[PDB]
Amino acid sequence: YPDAPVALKPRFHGRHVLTRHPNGLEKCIGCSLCAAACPAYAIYVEPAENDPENPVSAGERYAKVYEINMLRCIFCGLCEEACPTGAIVLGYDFEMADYEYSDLVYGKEDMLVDVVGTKPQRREAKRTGKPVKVGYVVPYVRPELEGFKAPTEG
Amino acid sequence: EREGILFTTLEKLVAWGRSNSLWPATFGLACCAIEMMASTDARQADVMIVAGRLSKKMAPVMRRVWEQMPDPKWVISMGACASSGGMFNNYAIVQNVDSVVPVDVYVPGCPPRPEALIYAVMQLQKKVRGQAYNERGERLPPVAA
Amino acid sequence: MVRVKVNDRIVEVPPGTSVMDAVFHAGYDVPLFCSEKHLSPIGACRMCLVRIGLPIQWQPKLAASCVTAVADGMVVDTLSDVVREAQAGMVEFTLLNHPLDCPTCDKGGACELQDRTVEYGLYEKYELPVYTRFEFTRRHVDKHHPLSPFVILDRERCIHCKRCVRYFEEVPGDEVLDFIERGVHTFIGTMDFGLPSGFSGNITDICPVGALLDLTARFRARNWEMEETPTTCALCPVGCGITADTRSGELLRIRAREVPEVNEIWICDAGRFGHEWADQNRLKTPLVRKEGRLVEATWEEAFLALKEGLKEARGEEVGLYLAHDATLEEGLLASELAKALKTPHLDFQGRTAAPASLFPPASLEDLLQADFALVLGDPTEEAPILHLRLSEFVRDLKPPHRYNHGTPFADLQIKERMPRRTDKMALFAPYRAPLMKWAAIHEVHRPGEEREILLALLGDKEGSEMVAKAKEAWEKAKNPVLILGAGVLQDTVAAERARLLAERKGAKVLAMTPAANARGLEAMGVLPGAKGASWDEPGALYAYYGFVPPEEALKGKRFVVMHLSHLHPLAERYAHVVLPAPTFYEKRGHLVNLEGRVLPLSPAPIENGEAEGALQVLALLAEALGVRPPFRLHLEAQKALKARKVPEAMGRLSFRLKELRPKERKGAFYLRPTMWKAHQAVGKAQEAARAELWAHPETARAEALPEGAQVAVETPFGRVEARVVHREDVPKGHLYLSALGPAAGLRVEGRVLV
Amino acid sequence: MRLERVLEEARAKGYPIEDNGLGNLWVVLPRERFKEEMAHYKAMGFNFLADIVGLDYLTYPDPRPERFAVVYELVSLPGWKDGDGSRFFVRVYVPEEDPRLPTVTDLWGSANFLEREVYDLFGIVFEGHPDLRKILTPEDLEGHPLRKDYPLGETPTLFREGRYIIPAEFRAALTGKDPGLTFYKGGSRKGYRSLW
Amino acid sequence: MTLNVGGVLRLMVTLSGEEVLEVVPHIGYLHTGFEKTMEHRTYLQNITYTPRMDYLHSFAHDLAYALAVEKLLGAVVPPRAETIRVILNELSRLASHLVFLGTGLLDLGALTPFFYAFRERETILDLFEWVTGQRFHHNYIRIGGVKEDLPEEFVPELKKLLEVLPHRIDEYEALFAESPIFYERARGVGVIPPEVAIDLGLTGGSLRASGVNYDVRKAYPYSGYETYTFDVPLGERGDVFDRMLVRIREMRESVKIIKQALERLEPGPVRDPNPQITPPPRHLLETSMEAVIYHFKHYTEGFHPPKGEVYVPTESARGELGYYIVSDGGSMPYRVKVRAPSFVNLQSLPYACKGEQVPDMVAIIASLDPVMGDVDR
Amino acid sequence: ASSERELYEAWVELLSWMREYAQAKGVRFEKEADFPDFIYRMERPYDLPTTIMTASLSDGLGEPFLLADVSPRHAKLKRIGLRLPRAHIHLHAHYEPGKGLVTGKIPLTKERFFALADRAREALAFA
Ligand code: SF4
Ligand code: SF4
Ligand code: SF4
Ligand code: SF4
Ligand code: SF4
Ligand code: SF4
Ligand code: FES
Ligand SMILES: [Ca+2]
Ligand SMILES: [Ca+2]
Ligand SMILES: [Ca+2]
């Protein structure tokens, strides 16, 4: 029924999203805890020092590289759990089947809250010129995914 | 002649053709086997769908099933265990089904939602059309071979 | 030995043992914050509290197990509620003002505070548990403020163990750190800004928390995320034990590895911060010259082009020249290859005119139990860690008892702020050496002049009063040790006399070779023959190089294969076939220490590229000449060393050798032996590795050299720009050049271009 | 109750009894006496052979008698004629060089598959088993996986720019016999246990 | 005549004639290696590996391992935890029985009764997605209790499905008891001797289908099953007819349990607050250093339970299930062996269909209810 | 009270003075650390004027000569603090309704601050 969107529960385990505070700062402080807690060794994090002039996160430290191998990932949300800032939270998207193995490792700007759709969903709507129709809807956005705009009309 | 319009528009019609004569021939294994039965129930075969942990013992077996198939054929890989080494990174499992059969589409999840297996063949579909590319931006060959 | 009952276990243990080490030896445990392997115990933080009974009669107040000695028939309770409750509290106090950085803190899961916090903290009494009682404003101060380019200090974290400051006054002897105000307000600070001593890096490895941190590797990976690779630093002859942290093929950080036999748990800065270069710019594909320029080529292509330059070659004109840090295997192979391939000129980069195998190797153990130290050279540069053992030596310290847990936590032997004896050592060198401070008998000479001082010592001449007090010291010397380095080992005259002085008195010697694996390559026979052509002598016609030689030795030769690791300009202008080689970090094989000890080399998972070790390249260049080599890989090369009867790891290889090939000294400039190596000048090490140029202010300004000028200088070893420094300790009219290489201890012609 | 009679007996006969506070109790039998003594157990009313599980103590901190060791779990099902509920385990340390051990197929038919598994994963043979054939591991798997010196066989996980992760060198977790990332480990991370 | 017929289970059916000589099974095709890799994971991390063996009544696996570790390092599961943990356990047991009952509806043709059972199941799985955010393999059971509390919309929806099921389970018992074809199809075949079953270890609730009264939830009570309105279904003679009914009878009872536990569901804590076993309440991570330290440590290198060896039996829909864990005082277990009920159950199969017809050999294995991820693992 | 709110407001100010003096007399201002109760704040709310909690006016070598900090929102006995490192001088500034920012009875005005900063800079800076 890909003509009429699927209704997932608020708590569903979908493509990971990286959240921000209202300040515009990335919540994530490049600590690599999420990765350390992963049962499938599916996260790689390279940290880096903030620039006091042009910040990124609040700490002295932020995540330069944040990558998640969406094939290995088992979707436990152990990472969301271990995170001590609430930066990584499990999103809603699931329409993310793709073609070449390595195209399935999601990068930082593939996961920020201000992103719409998945790596392949977007890529199509790029060479298409037609916006992204997400095949899902929910009762409401979780509190924890604060900022994440999605089809919620219930 | 091969690159002319006459040949192209033919093969572009041919492809568009079996782009719909797609005959999903499931090959389920563990838990994934039970989430695919929730999509084939909602509604000679090409397109085998690997859904679950491919043991090393089970490997040379799925291999034969694939060989003895038509020639215009495709392989979707269902979820972590099929796609990647899954979360079982050990002696007992193959770390990518591409090690034994060529995969045309991978579908992340564990098990991937049923509705995602739908979207997954849609991708396979829209690729045998030769109407699909990767992130680098290259046109992708409709068949794995 | 003494009878001591820990909890339920009873243990024998020497008389002057720490109650702490008692406990750990029995196989128990206690919160440990301020005490440290090799540093004076003081009962500072008060974590290692225990209860003690001694007749059973229970002592009234808990004791600091780290500073209370064991007595016969002593019970030490480390489990009573009374005890846990106390540790629990002490931990609470330590955490009371701490800063809450963990996730962001570079101390990762390798932090003594965290671990003990979790280990003993939060007391179980016998409802909603309370994680924190203290609800007031924490102590806020300075943060992430770098003391030097290599150490970044975070005052807020510090817990006021005395480890760092204590270390400084004790091991190196360079007090450049110490608490400031008092009470809750005290903190770590300095007024000697650069962090002078060549041994600062160690405070990074001692600091229980994230206050003192390795800036060279700030914010790269968390401590578990790293791939540790235990191995040996081969920058100099002492072969300390290191661990190399690597992640995703790049080298992130270097640390000390405990190896008490040789270097203890210490590492000089050059060894620990000079890793900037290895994983950065590097030659990754063999090059061969096509049209008067070098171009990438497959090893297949190279091998053929190699065959070509050597088809027309008589097997005696072949030259083999290894690098100062050539493995024991690479040396043995190159030996036989020059044996079958009948040639006279095979040498190794750092080769001393006087073979270090001359003198009987002396253990670092021996050095502590010797009764005098006669030094002719600057240990602080030639073989750094020696300085630190001599620090233990000048304190009359002697190798601690080994316990069930190895090297002891609280050695009561070591008292804080000890007195240093200046009668236990004599120091002679071309400048005001650093260790001249703990040397009563001490004098400054001029370049290549040790020959006369060594003579005088023998008894065949009159030297200064100093040399005289030195003679009479060495005379009244019961079981002394001779430490000698560059000048001495590089001039046949002196070198010979040194050996004599050390034969007559039954004493051992420390060869401060400028070649890392000198004592090891000498044991394999990588020494030039009758003919001549040595590593700086342009003799041979077709030669293999494991390093960039003096420009003079290249110019002329018919065919040159340079097995470098980085592209030197001298190569891309004189080299015919350049092949990529691994650094000692990513090699495999054994080395021979300056004490004759043989130390292993493991391979770090760094980015080799398409390179291979000289073990292959040699064998490959052996085919294009004639005979098939005897060595393929390591597993098989091992057989040929175990053949020659060279001991396994850690063993010491005894091997003497009486033969010396002299050469004249063109005394204009003196390449002053330095800790840092030339090829290290990258990143943060960029400055600490720049060459220098010293001279006496008269002759300095008489040859027109301002006190802070950037000058260009030319030696037979190359043109280098160096800072210029005035020094009243520099003999009149000579110029001391930073001999950043292994060509140190040499007098050379040359001049200051303008 | 049929268990007290096992204990009152083992007590007299130099059979060491293990017991953890949680409700599980063992009884080590030496090599020889095992065979027969166990038959005697079933004869005593021990219906059902629940599990059997091989253990390899090679990487265990505190030393043990012999390297491998096998546990069995004999029981009297409470749904039958005169079943109490008397469950218990029995152990036998099997020499690193003599992987031999008498089957129990004789009295229990459950040991058929179960003994096969313990042969498959650890190197342990069983004297007189109908067919000692590999149960779980592919035919051509050389050796025995479940034992501590047999590589778990891991592949580095892959990421974009040649970023890899060899799990073995990445794990933050500590393997009991492992000293930890600091000099050592002590306190409530050498082992913890709350008090009811 | 040896015919090589081969869920993901291969059978060597030696067979000259139309009888059945000996059936020689060959498994190993879903050998994922759990027992080995769990020796290389946090005790927390292992909770994601446990539901991937019996992917149908997985929660029973979760609880079986949780209980073994809980006791080992001695933790106490709150009131509301234990309650949720059976509401969760049995709700999953219904899911594994709905499948078994559903595959027996097809082999009986009854096709609208099936189009219902597959909807029931999905309604249960909807519940698992409400609370645990997953269809299955739910990371919900924690060593102290449960990851987080249940949502507002769990109690309501569980009422909907806990209201239409009462008589509905009888409708399923109806069709199979008023056996048109069924009588002649199962009533005799698959002879399970009450005293040979207790020799091969056929403990899986298909034990009692053949006349034994050994249910572990009563015999050796665990998560408070000791305190419930509990009926253990019984079978007369060990055929397959009884085995299809017993398992339907079990649903009747598991539903009573859910209803009964749902009554004592008063608000409170969800995991043991003991800091050495449980991460610090999320919220104070902005104040307590001790909190930051514990949290940072807890999720990097997990906790260390004492040295020792424990085991505790539970009962999944497929019988006795237990984890035998060997702790060496590390962050990870030293050994984990799993008592796979479907593994020992499978030894009662050569005998099961001994000398029977061959077209009967499908519903003969399916009436033993093996799950391959269980046997193989 | 809601005087708490006004304290932080003033702390924002104290910082603005610091940044001013910094770029003014040609000497480095540095945010030393941000509130932990912000960094690790998650879905939880936050309505404080800044994230910056510890600040310094450091010299050429980086060694601070002035150190200011305010107490985190979740703490007790709140105060904004001044500290001249190395010279044992600690000032605790409170907040009184209508009077303003005070160190006891004496007001802490931009003037008085700038004075303190200088005394320190001139006598305590290493480079
Ligand atoms: S959901 Fe699980 S597998 Fe995926 S990144 Fe998070 S912890 Fe790793
Ligand atoms: S997402 Fe969270 S746990 Fe992961 S690195 Fe960022 S702050 Fe740390
Ligand atoms: S990918 Fe997940 S659901 Fe699918 S077989 Fe593997 S563990 Fe089971
Ligand atoms: S020194 Fe240790 S306890 Fe303190 S913040 Fe750093 S990692 Fe945490
Ligand atoms: S900086 Fe580190 S080593 Fe020095 S006193 Fe502070 S805690 Fe100890
Ligand atoms: S003293 Fe020598 S071996 Fe030791 S760390 Fe320094 S250069 Fe390396
Ligand atoms: S008191 Fe600090 S270790 Fe003994
Ligand atoms: Ca580097
Ligand atoms: Ca990189
Ligand atoms: Ca500063």
Structural domains for chain E: 1-377 (1.10.645.10)
Cβ partners under 8 Å of residue D12, min gap 6: none
- Whether residue D49 contacts residue D73, with contact meaning beta carbons closer than 8 Å, is answered with yes
- Whether residue B106 contacts residue A104, with contact meaning beta carbons closer than 8 Å, is answered with yes
In whole angstroms, what is the distance from residue C451 CA to residue C437 CA? 24
**Nearest CB neighbour to F36, from listed E282, E283, E286:** E286
3-state secondary structure C128-174: CCCCCCCCECCCCCCCCEECCCCEEECCCCCCCCCHHHHHHHHCCCC
Ligand 6 mutation target, pool C204, C216, C238, C275, most atoms within 8 A of CB = C238
In whole angstroms, what is the distance from residue C454 CA to residue C469 CA? 13
Please state whether C522 falls in left (phi above 0), alpha (psi between -120 and 50) or beta.
alpha
In whole angstroms, what is the distance from residue C425 CA to residue C473 CA? 9
- Please check whether residue D159 touches B, CB under 8 A: no
> How many angstroms away from the CA of E284 is the closest CA of chain F?
9
In whole angstroms, what is the distance from residue B87 CA to residue A75 CA? 10
- Whether residue C388 contacts residue C404, with contact meaning beta carbons closer than 8 Å, is answered with no
- Whether residue C61 contacts residue C78, with contact meaning beta carbons closer than 8 Å, is answered with no
* Continuous segment of H or E residues that includes residue C338: helix C328-340
Tokens of A107: 């990068």
Strand C508-511 with C481-484, pairing: parallel
Tokens of E93: 């047991």
* Continuous segment of H or E residues that includes residue C712: strand C710-715
Using alpha carbons only, what angle is made at residue E250 by residues E248 and E252, rounded to the nearest 5 degrees?
A: 80
In whole angstroms, what is the distance from residue A37 CA to residue E298 CA? 10
User: Ligand 10 mean position to C94 CA, how many Å?
Assistant: 24
DSSP SS3 for C322? strand
How many CA atoms, within 13 angstroms, populate the side-chain half-sphere of residue E121?
23
Cβ partners under 8 Å of residue E164, min gap 6: none
Tokens of C601: 């080399």
In whole angstroms, what is the distance from residue C677 CA to residue C515 CA? 12
Where do the structural domains in chain C lie, given as residue ranges? 1-217, 218-754
Residue with tokens 């020094």: C727
For B109, nearest residue in chain A (alpha carbons): A74
**Nearest CB neighbour to D109, from listed E310, E329, E347:** E347
Phi, psi of E264 (to 5 degrees): -90, 35
Q: Which ligand is nearest to the CA of C160?
A: 5
In whole angstroms, what is the distance from residue C285 CA to residue C287 CA? 6
Contact list in B for residue A75 (CB cut-off 8 A) is 109-110
Using alpha carbons only, what angle is made at residue C324 by residues C320 and C326, rounded to the nearest 5 degrees?
A: 70
Q: Is the peptide bond before C629 cis (omega within 30 degrees of 0)?
A: no
Q: Do A49 and C225 touch (CB under 8 A)?
A: no
CA E300 to chain centroid, in Å, comes to 30
- Whether residue A1 contacts residue B42, with contact meaning beta carbons closer than 8 Å, is answered with yes
- Whether residue F127 contacts residue F61, with contact meaning beta carbons closer than 8 Å, is answered with yes
CB-based burial label for E84 (10 Å; 0-12, 13-18, 19+):
buried
- Whether residue D105 contacts residue D115, with contact meaning beta carbons closer than 8 Å, is answered with yes
Q: Please, after which residues is chain A broken with C–N above 2.5 Å?
A: none
In whole angstroms, what is the distance from residue D55 CA to residue E309 CA? 11
Please state whether C376 falls in left (phi above 0), alpha (psi between -120 and 50) or beta.
beta
**Nearest CA to F48 among C630, D7, A21?**
A21
Using alpha carbons only, what angle is made at residue C570 by residues C564 and C571, rounded to the nearest 5 degrees?
A: 45
Strand C74-77 with C49-53, pairing: antiparallel
How many CA atoms, within 13 angstroms, populate the side-chain half-sphere of residue C668?
11
Amino acid at site E173: E
For E72, nearest residue in chain D (alpha carbons): D22
**Nearest CA to C700 among C709, C690, C691, C688?**
C709
In whole angstroms, what is the distance from residue C64 CA to residue E16 CA? 84
F76 DSSP β-pair partners: C136
C376 DSSP β-pair partners: C428, C484
- Whether residue B73 contacts residue B105, with contact meaning beta carbons closer than 8 Å, is answered with no
> How many angstroms away from the CA of C180 is the closest CA of chain F?
7
D49 to C277, D67, D103, E211: CA distances (angstroms): 65, 24, 13, 18
How many CA atoms, within 13 angstroms, populate the side-chain half-sphere of residue C39?
25
In whole angstroms, what is the distance from residue F90 CA to residue C182 CA? 13
Amino acid at site C690: R
In whole angstroms, what is the distance from residue C739 CA to residue C678 CA? 8
**Nearest CA to C117 among E290, D191, E282, E299?**
E290
How many CA atoms, within 13 angstroms, populate the side-chain half-sphere of residue E271?
22
Determine whether the annotation assigns residue A32 to a binding site: yes
For D163, nearest residue in chain A (alpha carbons): A44
Q: Which residues of C are annotated as a binding site for [2Fe-2S] cluster?
A: 34, 45, 48, 66
Q: Do A61 and C224 touch (CB under 8 A)?
A: no
Strand order in the sheet with C559-562: C294-296, C287-289, C577-578, C559-562, C542-545, C318-322, C346-348
Cβ partners under 8 Å of residue B11, min gap 6: none
F70 DSSP β-pair partners: F80
DSSP SS3 for E198? helix
- Whether residue E347 contacts residue D110, with contact meaning beta carbons closer than 8 Å, is answered with yes
F33 DSSP β-pair partners: F54
Q: What is the resolution of this structure in A?
A: 3.2
Q: What is the DSSP letter of C405?
A: T
Contact list in E for residue C114 (CB cut-off 8 A) is 293, 296-297
In whole angstroms, what is the distance from residue D89 CA to residue D23 CA? 11
Domain of A20 in residue numbering reads as: 1-154
How many CA atoms, within 13 angstroms, populate the side-chain half-sphere of residue D176?
25
In whole angstroms, what is the distance from residue D114 CA to residue A63 CA? 50
Tokens of E373: 């991820």
Q: Do E133 and A12 touch (CB under 8 A)?
A: yes
Give the DSSP letter string of E115-160: HHHHHHHHHHHHHHHHHSSSSSS-TTEETTEESS---TTHHHHHHH
In whole angstroms, what is the distance from residue E76 CA to residue E67 CA? 10
B59 to B99, D153, E252: CA distances (angstroms): 9, 17, 41
Tokens of C418: 């000890």
Helices vs strands, H then E, count in chain B = 5, 4
C268 lines ligand 6 (CB under 6 A): yes
D70 DSSP β-pair partners: D54, D92
Helices vs strands, H then E, count in chain A = 3, 7
The CATH number of the domain covering residues in F1-127: 3.30.920.80
In whole angstroms, what is the distance from residue E307 CA to residue E334 CA? 10
**Nearest CB neighbour to B91, from listed D153, D157, D167:** D153
Strand order in the sheet with A61-69: A43-49, A61-69, A105-106
In whole angstroms, what is the distance from residue A17 CA to residue A142 CA? 12
Would you tell me which residues 233-262 of chain E have a C-beta closer than 8 angstroms to some C-beta of chain D?
none
CA E48 to chain centroid, in Å, comes to 15
D87 to C607, D3, D70, D148: CA distances (angstroms): 58, 7, 17, 29
Phi, psi of C332 (to 5 degrees): -65, -40
CB-based burial label for C683 (10 Å; 0-12, 13-18, 19+):
middle
All domains in chain B, ordered by first residue:
1-145 (3.40.50.12280)
Number of domains, chain A = 1
User: What Rg, from alpha-carbon coordinates, does chain E have?
Assistant: 22
Give the DSSP letter string of B125-143: HHHHTS--B-TT--B--SS
Question: Hey, how many other C-beta atoms are within 10 angstroms of the C-beta on C395?
Answer: 20
**Nearest CA to D44 among D92, D93, D7, D19?**
D7
> How many angstroms away from the CA of A134 is the closest CA of chain D?
26
Cβ partners under 8 Å of residue C111, min gap 6: C102, C105, C208, C209, C210, D182
Strand C318-322 with C346-348, pairing: parallel
Tokens of C725: 């420094």
**Nearest CA to C91 among C136, C131, C61?**
C131
DSSP SS3 for D158? strand
Contact list in C for residue F62 (CB cut-off 8 A) is 145-146
How many CA atoms, within 13 angstroms, populate the side-chain half-sphere of residue F82?
23
In whole angstroms, what is the distance from residue C448 CA to residue C426 CA? 18
Could you tell me the sign of the dihedral formed by the alpha carbons of C428, C432, C434, C436, in that order?
positive
- Whether residue C689 contacts residue C681, with contact meaning beta carbons closer than 8 Å, is answered with yes
Q: What is the DSSP letter of B123?
A: H
* Continuous segment of H or E residues that includes residue E161: helix E154-177
**Nearest CA to F37 among E288, A34, C128?**
E288
* Continuous segment of H or E residues that includes residue C377: none
